[PDB]
Amino acid sequence: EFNILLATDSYKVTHYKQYPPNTSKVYSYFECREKKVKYEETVFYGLQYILNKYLKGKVVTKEKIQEAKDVYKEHFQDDVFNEKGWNYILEKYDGHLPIEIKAVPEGFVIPRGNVLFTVENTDPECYWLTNWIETILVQSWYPITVATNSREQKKILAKYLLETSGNLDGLEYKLHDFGYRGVSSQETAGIGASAHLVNFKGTDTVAGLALIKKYYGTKDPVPGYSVPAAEHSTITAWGKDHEKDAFEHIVTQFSSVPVSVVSDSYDIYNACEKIWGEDLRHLIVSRSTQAPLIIRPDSGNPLDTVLKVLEILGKKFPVTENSKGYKLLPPYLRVIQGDGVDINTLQEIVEGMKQKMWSIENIAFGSGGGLLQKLTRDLLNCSFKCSYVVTNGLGINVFKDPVADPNKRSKKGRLSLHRTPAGNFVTLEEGKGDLEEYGQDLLHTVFKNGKVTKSYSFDEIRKNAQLN
Amino acid sequence: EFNILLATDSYKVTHYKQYPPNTSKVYSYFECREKVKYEETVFYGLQYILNKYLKGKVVTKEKIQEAKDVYKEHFQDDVFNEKGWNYILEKYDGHLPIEIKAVPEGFVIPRGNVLFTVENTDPECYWLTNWIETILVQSWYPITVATNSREQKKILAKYLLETSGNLDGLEYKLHDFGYRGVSSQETAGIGASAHLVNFKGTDTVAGLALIKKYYGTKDPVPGYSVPAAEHSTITAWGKDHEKDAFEHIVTQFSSVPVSVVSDSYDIYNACEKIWGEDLRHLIVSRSTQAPLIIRPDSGNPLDTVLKVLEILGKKFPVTENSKGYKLLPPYLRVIQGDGVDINTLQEIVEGMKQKMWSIENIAFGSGGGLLQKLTRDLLNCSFKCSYVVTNGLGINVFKDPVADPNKRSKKGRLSLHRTPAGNFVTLEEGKGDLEEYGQDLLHTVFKNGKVTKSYSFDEIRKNAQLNIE
Ligand SMILES: O=C(/C=C/c1cccnc1)NCCc1ccc(-c2cc3c(N4CCC[C@H](C(=O)NCc5ccc6sccc6c5)C4)ncnc3s2)cc1
Ligand SMILES: O=C(/C=C/c1cccnc1)NCCc1ccc(-c2cc3c(N4CCC[C@H](C(=O)NCc5ccc6sccc6c5)C4)ncnc3s2)cc1
Ligand SMILES: [Cl-]
Ligand SMILES: [Cl-]
Q1: Is B106 annotated as a binding residue?
Q2: How far is the CA of A273 from the centre of ligand 1 (A)?
Q3: How many angstroms does the Cα of residue B229 sit away from the middle of ligand 4?
Q4: Ligand 2 within 6 A of B225 CB?
Q5: Where would you tag: which of A85, A349, A429, B248 has the fewest CB atoms within 10 A of its CB?
């Protein structure tokens, strides 16, 4: 079973002896710091998952306290574990956490440098607990960063899909998650795939569906979708001389639905020009608009291969010109680039496609490691800092202001998030939120004393993160 | 509960209708493709994946029904192989009819070598080999953490030896500060365990639990830590009392090494004045066993380390060691934990060497740089089919993309061998059959739902030791 006591940074365990004596309240906040792709606005998503799966309900037990005491005794070569303080949470509160967490609604799109959630203890005996859970709470940068980075790529696709097409049809299916293999672990797969689906509807990371359903929920039958697709083993199993028989068997097996067939096993160009183009050309034309053939290259320079694949297919299938003057394949043929795609190369591909007058209706993208694994806590400066302590009945605003780095500066005091008269967001410090000059605090209590007090559906989160 | 039927790539759900008819065997392998050049990799983590996700009765009639419900909605068509899964439940009691053979964990293998192979033991489950590709390819992460960690250990031993003449304390020099940095809790444990294959110091506690549960060690725990401060336990005394926080913390942990972050307001001022004059008496008094460690969390990593060392040198008696390098008094040490990755770490030690400072003075903490800034792309960890049997005929299969020379894969049934000189070679096309029995490194670790050979963490550490060690 998961044990919360063994779920914190090792140095934190000794923290209780280090705060000022008679400290009754430790108050901390989480933000995505401004740094002086831009990544100016970040999507808040994923806190609920950590609340339900790791903090809600009874999370302290006699067993868990004894397991922890014995680990830290060897780990530290000394008895420094705060047994008495953990036991207190067990006896007085039936092992529920005396903590309050207020957060922006999940799905809200917030400019950098703003407070998105705050943590404090509700019992003065548990001043040490606020930051005890900072490590677990700080892990939300991953869901935040995936969904923010996912959504920035959605912006890019929209811009060019509108520039070359005149509409946004299918936008939500244009970036497909191919990252299940790439992620550090099964749990990360689920979280990461969940954050992508805040913005899109296509994934092959089946773990993401289970996570949404268990912790968020949706009125829809499933949060995400996919189609049959081939992989190198299925294609290469027939042997190199029978690449055409595999293609034929696979399009025949899935004729009523879209099918993605990777065509780079031996020679991408040969498959496109001769096998798809001439030998199996009759099969492609027959397919309905609803179930088209998606030719997938998986090798070479990502932009250059996309372009040359499109030129060959244009020289082999009836290509038309849409309203904006960009060339468009027939509806039974599409292309998916799923190799070497991240936010940067995605920009180069679409910009390349536009200047050679190919419309974005033709293409879709797959991203794996570039979508769910090549991201760091550093990207958005997600950080968790103490802004307010109460010691001996006196509240004082606490912050860090390193001389070397201006940016690592932390907000001071009790904080709140407000909507401005112009319609933007401002974070107020030093309890200024109490005055309510700009209206009510947008932070809502989502956790208190071991109970999840406000929850959002994945369907709300999707609507809050919609592009303007 | 975790469900294997829901733990694969969506499109693999439809692969059982794509293989050639009458396919009775699908045989695949894993390797880190040939491209700090990352020439050799440490194999670690498969045992975790075998025990947690692949052993025992991993199929139930309830799990089949769950998977069938999701997939029908997910693809919006009926494509789930209910019958194939049902066959595994009835005839094997939901145990996987799969054999996996693997190089021993801890082994250091040059790139381009097969590390393990997967094959189905029952002709009806030809579709099962690559169904579990996604779950097994995720051993790219422990392999990559263990490998990158090791490479940093190489750097640190070379410069510790040059500036010191000994490797004392080497395995405590790179300290895991990555628990907050990782994507998920499961990752934090896997990664931190992988780093402990080379070092003994970690603060990602999840790492300790994973090793004990899956690998085990004779010692009570594999990783150690000390008490240390954070920005909240300094700044909560108020800016005007940073000296009082320092004094309180050092006093509390007098008998053990204690590390305090001193850059909350002004790092230079803190070292020169608060540590240097106001609290100097409390530092000199401290024992060699439990020295004061000063940590700077801001600014340029190389510059700040030097400026801290320069200042402390002027307030504390500095000696010169056997090799002619500057060495702080035994009760005072520094630890750099901000912005450290394999690249910067090399720069810092090299920078220290230029200014004639012994590596004995320093320790490093790494967070995201150690456990998060890593991709499957770094070592080209990849899982490919190399051999199938269709219509009772064995065929060697491979992918040879024209555009990329490197992506090409091995053909046939594989084996790993050591020549009498000691270099490694993987024999393709089943030519390992020609070689004498017992030569092959790959030992069966998983067959039909049971783990058949296991290694303990102590042995894994022994296997992964550096040549210099
Ligand atoms: O390849 C793989 C393998 C991945 C993998 C996994 C693991 C490891 N390694 C790799 N998985 C492909 C899955 C996939 C990806 C994208 C799409 C798209 C749908 C769509 C779209 N909707 C949605 C479907 C229904 C309609 C509709 O059917 N429209 C027709 C249409 C139009 C354009 C395009 S472009 C590609 C398909 C397509 C279909 C309207 N509206 C505009 N754009 C697009 S894109 C469909 C399926
Ligand atoms: O501050 C932090 C920040 C944490 C954090 C967490 C999460 C997020 N954010 C931050 N974590 C400090 C933990 C830490 C790190 C490194 C070390 C070292 C020990 C050691 C060593 N030993 C080991 C102990 C016994 C002997 C011995 O003499 N021990 C005393 C000694 C000697 C040299 C040095 S050098 C630096 C320390 C030190 C201590 C020999 N032999 C040579 N090198 C080193 S390094 C000790 C403790
Ligand atoms: Cl593939
Ligand atoms: Cl810290």
Answers
A1: no
A2: 22
A3: 6
A4: yes
A5: A85
What is the rounded distance in angstroms from the CA atom of residue A10 to the CA atom of residue A13? 6
A95 with A149, same domain?
A: no
Residue A182 annotated as part of some ligand binding site: no
Both B466 and B450 in a single domain? no
Give dist(CA B437, CA B181) in Å, integer: 46
Between CA B337 and CA B325 the distance in angstroms is: 23
Q: Which of A15, A16, A18 is most worth mutating to test chain B (most B CB atoms within 10 A of its CB)? A: A18
Q: Give the pairing of strands A333-337 and A363-367.
A: parallel
Is A131 an interface residue toward B (CB < 8 Å)?
yes
A464 within ligand 1 shell (Cβ under 6 A)? no
DSSP state of B104: P
What's the CA gap between B43 and B29, in Å, rounded? 14
The answer to whether residues B190 and B73 belong to one domain is no
Whether the CA torsion B191, B196, B199, B205 is positive or negative: it is positive
Q: How far apart are CA B286 and CA B297, in angstroms?
A: 24
Euclidean distance between CA atoms B113 and A275, whole angstroms: 34
Header resolution in angstroms: 2.8
Report the distance separating Cα A142 and Cα A148, nearest Å: 10
Within this chain, do residues B393 and B299 fall inside the same structural domain, yes or no?
A: no
Question: Would the CA dihedral through A157, A162, A166, A167 be positive or negative?
Answer: positive
Looking up tokens 């097969």, which residue turns up? B114
CB interface of B with A, residues 163-192, below 8 Å: 177, 179-187, 190-191
Q: How many domains does chain A have?
A: 2
3-class SS of residue B313: helix
Residues of B in contact with A369 (CB under 8 A): 375-377
CA A55 to chain centre: 21
SS3 B467: coil
Interface residue A133 vs chain B (CB under 8 A)? no
Q: Which of B140, B267, B384 is opposite residue A403, by nearest beta carbon?
A: B267
Measuring CA to CA, which residue among B303, B17, B261, B336 is closest to residue A15? Answer: B261
Residues A209, A239, single domain; the answer is: yes
Cβ-contact A168, A162 below 8 angstroms: yes
- Residue B1 neighbours by CB under 8 Å, 6+ apart: none
Q: Which residue's structure tokens are 């906040």?
A: A29
* CB within 8 Å: B14 and A254: yes
Work out the widest C-alpha separation in chain A, in whole angstroms: 84
Question: Are residues B146 and B118 part of one domain?
Answer: no
**What technique was this entry resolved by?**
X-ray
Strand partners, A389: A26, A396
The boundaries of the domain holding residue B438 are 1-137+376-454
Phi/psi of residue B121, nearest 5 degrees: -95, -10
Residue B465 and residue B339 share a domain = yes
> Of B172, B185, B111, nearest to B147 (Cα)?
B111
Q: Decide if A184 and B185 are in contact by the 8 Å CB cutoff.
A: no
Three-state secondary-structure class, residue B381? strand
Interface contact B401-A299, CB threshold 8 A: yes
Residue B338, annotated as binding a ligand = yes
For residues A60 and B72, what is the distance between their CA atoms, to the nearest angstrom?
40
B337 lines ligand 2 (CB under 6 A): yes
